[PDB]
Each structure stands twice: as C-alpha cells, then as structure tokens.
Amino acid sequence: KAAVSHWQQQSYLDSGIHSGATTTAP
C-alpha cells in the first residue's frame, strides 16, 4: 500500500519539467 499507491505521486515529477527536476532531485 505504501509502495503500491505512492508510486504515482512521485513518478509524475520526472515527466519533464524544464528538465530541472533531475538536478535537485538526485
């Protein structure tokens, strides 16, 4: 449940937001 319904509100942050969501995320 904590890994079956919490993988949606976290997998949409890497869609492609100015490609800047991979500089402060990692």
From Swiss-Prot:
This is Catenin beta-1. The modification Phosphothreonine is found at T23. Expressed in several hair follicle cell types: basal and peripheral matrix cells, and cells of the outer and inner root sheaths. Expressed in colon. Present in cortical neurons (at protein level). Expressed in breast cancer tissues (at protein level). It is found in: Cytoplasm; Nucleus; Cytoplasm, Cytoskeleton; Cell junction, Adherens junction. The chain holds residues 19 to 44 of 781 of the full protein. Two separate complex-associated pools are found in the cytoplasm. The majority is present as component of an E-cadherin:catenin adhesion complex composed of at least E-cadherin/CDH1 and beta-catenin/CTNNB1, and possibly alpha-catenin/CTNNA1; the complex is located to adherens junctions. The stable association of CTNNA1 is controversial as CTNNA1 was shown not to bind to F-actin when assembled in the complex. Alternatively, the CTNNA1-containing complex may be linked to F-actin by other proteins such as LIMA1. Phosphorylation proceeds then from Thr-23 to Ser-19 and Ser-15. Phosphorylated by NEK2. EGF stimulates tyrosine phosphorylation. Phosphorylated on Ser-15 and Ser-19 by HIPK2 and GSK3B, this phosphorylation triggers proteasomal degradation. Phosphorylation by CDK2 regulates insulin internalization. Ubiquitinated by the SCF(BTRC) E3 ligase complex when phosphorylated by GSK3B, leading to its degradation. Ubiquitinated by a E3 ubiquitin ligase complex containing UBE2D1, SIAH1, CACYBP/SIP, SKP1, APC and TBL1X, leading to its subsequent proteasomal degradation. Ubiquitinated and degraded following interaction with SOX9. Ubiquitinated via 'Lys-11'- and 'Lys-29'-linked ubiquitin chains by UBR5, leading to its stabilization. Belongs to the beta-catenin family. Changing I17S: In hepatocellular carcinoma.
